[PDB]
Amino acid sequence: RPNHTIYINNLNEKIKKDELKKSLHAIFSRFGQILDILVSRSLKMRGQAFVIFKEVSSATNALRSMQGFPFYDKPMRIQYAKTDSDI
RNA sequence: GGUCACGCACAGGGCAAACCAUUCGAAAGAGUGGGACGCAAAGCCUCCGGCCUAAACCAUUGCACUCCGGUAGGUAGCGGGGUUAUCGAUGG
Ligand SMILES: [Mg+2]
């Protein structure tokens, strides 16, 4: 089931993409070296983030540690990605 | 002559990119002044397509690595279209 990338759901949509990335990095950088964080604000990709880790284990840690985490008021929803595509 | 096209000019000349100052804006961007990259409509209008912004309301819990809600604003110097205008190469 597990994956290098984690999928974050239910994020506050009123936050700029600019800031959101930086906030997600500060929160998640404590578990491993993030390769990149993908955040779009299109109709489909609103309130959503992909955080690609160095390791799957480091990605397994962040999921098991910050589930439901109150983040910009709203609680985070984390689950593994379905495909780990990209270099 | 006039009309409809056209730009190898000629006459009057016209406009003003970037950048800087200042104002407005949530932003894209616009206004004014300075300033010239260029432009035969780089005068003017968002009807159509593209692109840029996303503060407020509406909608949306959505798995991406083409990119895409409504909504409003912007770009006419991104295209198309519409409309008006100078000269007139023994010009077509
Ligand atoms: Mg001026």
User: Which structural domains are found in chain A, ordered by start?
Assistant: 1-87 (3.30.70.330)
Q: Is A51 left (phi over 0), alpha (psi -120 to 50) or beta?
A: beta
Q: Residue for token digits 């800031």? A: A19
Please check whether strand B approaches the CB of A46 to within 7 Å. yes
CA A7 to ligand 1 centroid distance, Å: 52
Q: Which of A62, A66, A76, A82 is nearest to A20 (CA)?
A: A76
> Distance between CA A58 and CA A75 in Å, rounded?
21
A12 touches strand B (CB under 7 A): no
| DSSP state string for A46-80 | TT-EEEE-S-HHHHHHHHHHSTT-B-SSSBPEEEE
User: Count of CB atoms within 10 A of residue A68's CB?
Assistant: 10
Q: Which nucleotide is nearest to A48 (CA to C1')?
A: B62
Residues in CB range of A36: below 8 A, 6 or more apart: A52, A86
Q: Are A6 and A76 in contact (CB under 8 A)?
A: no
Q: How far is the CA of A81 from the centre of ligand 1 (A)?
A: 55
What is the secondary structure of A8-53 as a DSSP string? EES--TTS-HHHHHHHHHHHHTTSS--SEEE---STTTTT-EEEE-
State how far the Cα of A2 lies from the Cα of A56, in Å rounded to an integer.
Answer: 7
> How many CB atoms sit inside 10 A of residue A51's CB?
28
Q: Which residues pair with A6 in a beta bridge?
A: A51, A80
